[PDB]
Symmetry: C3
Subunit: 203 residues, 3 copies
């Protein structure tokens, strides 16, 4: 059985405008980085969304992109990940790991006002969930990828209360993948066998 | 005239869900790799499709992704490339190079049941076809890029017999590009001149 | 305040077919490169569009791709960038920096016939515009990203005179980003504060 090597990048970030992916995926090699609305294309610690083009872009998205500003600072201390709102506008985070910690609904979206920060991920909690997931079968273990994913919207909120009901309805959002947790999940997933119900070649 | 340097990656692989590209392109630097449905984001020998997100994903695709499992092993011995079905579900391959070898229709899709393998490419055959393609003109030489491309679907078949008629109708498939052959083709294409029928700036 | 490091790549190039992005972004590390319709996947000085696949491609695009040929040579001398038409078919360039230099409309598209070249960018002019942009506010400075972007179509023209009115209506085009200018803009943008009109979390 297989070999693992420590991820060179602790996370990857994908930017979206509504339901469309925009720009290349950003890979973070440093423990602290900022996703902002500016234009430096060569800072390994900055994912600058302002330089990303989209000929198909609409006015609402353009308008919102102008308010990203300093955006969000993403960093980790030990086994915990945080998101700090550097922007003059708030950011909205949907983190299953965070939501479960507070007993909130899994799809809960938490508002992080300017100047505030939130613990979007805790490894201990994830490791514990992963450990108990085995007794649930391939089914539950496979779905844990969602716990390694965190989505955040700049300026516009979505979900309960807000008119916008889904992340794809927001003008500017990012999707963060925590690579360490994903590798941890892989070590378990590869030993959980295959699904129960049969998937034919024709249906 | 120009200089060539040996490709650092023998192939590139693009993943798709129906007619939409999902995730970044994978580049293989090792002679053997596996494309599976798991989640390690840091193994140079594994293209793990399970960690790839798609907020726009439908139930059929999600369902099928759960059955990719160990997926397919792609490797080359000398000038020959093979695909082995490690998955508990079959994979379906459409390789023009393979199809021609057996006299099958160019768009033929070959089923590779679990545990089986198929020679999806042979360089000698390609080189020979390329050599005779010159007498066919820019036309035939330009179309040889198709010979350097191989498409494979996980779990679901397509083409003759199956309901699904095109690769874009399958939930999860990959597109492999053989870089050595592409460079070989380039050396010829750059010397084949331009098309015959005129392409205006207005039509 | 922040640190900048010289860009390892002087520019990035994105290829499109109509309104759809095709292929990975190309990053240039050498002062001279060519974007052609051929197939070498391993030359750091060549962005070969001919090897790029698109299962969703239409006949018009396929037809045009066959006429890209030697394509366009993009290179810089000092602080000036040029585009040379190596292709047997013309290329059409939309460069705000070039257009302003000649007093043409910002969206003007300039035809570069085979064998001809055009100065698509001049840093002195941009730096001067950037300097005066400050007195215009965040508004005008933010829009300068457009000056760092240049779009070019192969074979087919668009805009005034031609039937095609937008770049997204052309079969094969590229989008060039000048990284040095973008970093220069960043140094100013980060000091221009935030927008005037308020952007709420609900609208």
């Amino acid at each position: 059985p297989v070999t693992y090597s420590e991820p060179a990048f602790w996370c990857s970030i994908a930017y979206y405008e509504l339901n469309q992916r925009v720009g290349e995926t950003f890979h973070a090699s440093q423990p602290s980085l900022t996703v902002d609305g500016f234009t430096d294309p060569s800072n390994s610690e900055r994912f600058c969304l302002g330089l990303l083009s989209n000929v198909n872009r609409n006015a609402t998205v353009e308008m919102t992109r102008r308010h990203i500003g300093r955006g969000v600072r993403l960093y980790y201390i030990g086994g915990e990940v945080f998101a700090e709102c550097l922007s003059d506008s708030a950011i909205f985070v949907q983190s299953p790991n965070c939501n479960q910690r507070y007993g909130w609904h899994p799809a809960t979206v938490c508002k992080i006002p300017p100047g505030c920060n939130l613990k979007i991920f805790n490894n201990q909690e994830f490791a514990a969930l992963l450990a108990q997931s085995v007794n649930q079968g391939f089914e539950a273990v496979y779905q844990l990828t969602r716990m390694c994913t965190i989505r955040m919207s700049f300026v516009k909120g979505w979900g309960a209360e807000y008119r916008r009901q889904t992340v794809t309805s927001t003008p500017c959002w990012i999707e963060l993948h925590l690579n360490g947790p994903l590798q941890w999940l892989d070590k378990v997933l590869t030993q959980m066998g295959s699904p129960s119900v049969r998937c034919s070649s024709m249906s």
